[PDB]
Amino acid sequence: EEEIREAFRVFDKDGNGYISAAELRHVMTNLGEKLTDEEVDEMIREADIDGDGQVNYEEFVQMMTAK
Ligand SMILES: [Ca+2]
Ligand SMILES: [Ca+2]
């Protein structure tokens, strides 16, 4: 949980409590993963359950902790 929360805070550059798709591109691109805007749209749409177009802490946990 702390690893996921700390990681979630690391991607929330503005501390808004929500990770934007472009923010995902920043972390994924520097993390060594280069995704296109559509590939991130797929990850956002799959992890975005409220269709808000962004990943919140609960969605991030399920997407990375998808049991
Ligand atoms: Ca943010
Ligand atoms: Ca969402």
Architecture in CATH? Answer: Orthogonal Bundle
Cα-to-Cα separation, first versus last residue: 14 Å
- The general outline is globular
Domain count: the total is 1
Which topology does CATH recognise?
Answer: Recoverin, domain 1
Main beta sheet strand tally, sense and closure = 2 strands, antiparallel
**Number of H/I helices:** 4
Instruction: Output the strand order for the largest sheet.
Output: 1-2
What is the CATH superfamily? EF-hand
Rg, alpha carbons: 11 Å
* Percent range for β-strand residues: 5-15%
Count of β-strands: 2
Protein structure class = mainly alpha
Helical content (DSSP H or I, runs of 4+): 55-70%
Order of helices and strands: HEHHEH
The top level CATH class name: Mainly Alpha
Associated small molecules: calcium ion
PDB class: metal binding protein
Keywords: EF hands, helix bundle, calcium, dipolar coupling, metal binding protein
Assembly: monomeric
Entry title: Solution structure of Calcium calmodulin C-terminal domain
Give your account of this protein's structure:
This is Calmodulin-1. It comes from Homo sapiens (Human). Belongs to the calmodulin family. It is found in: Cytoplasm, Cytoskeleton, Spindle; Cytoplasm, Cytoskeleton, Spindle pole; Cytoplasm, Cytoskeleton, Microtubule organizing center, Centrosome; Cell projection, Cilium, Flagellum. This protein has about 70 residues and is mainly alpha-helical. The chain has a single domain, classed as Recoverin, domain 1, CATH 1.10.238.10. The protein is built from four helices and two strands, in the order αβααβα. The radius of gyration is 11 Å and the shape is globular. One calcium ion binds next to strand 1.
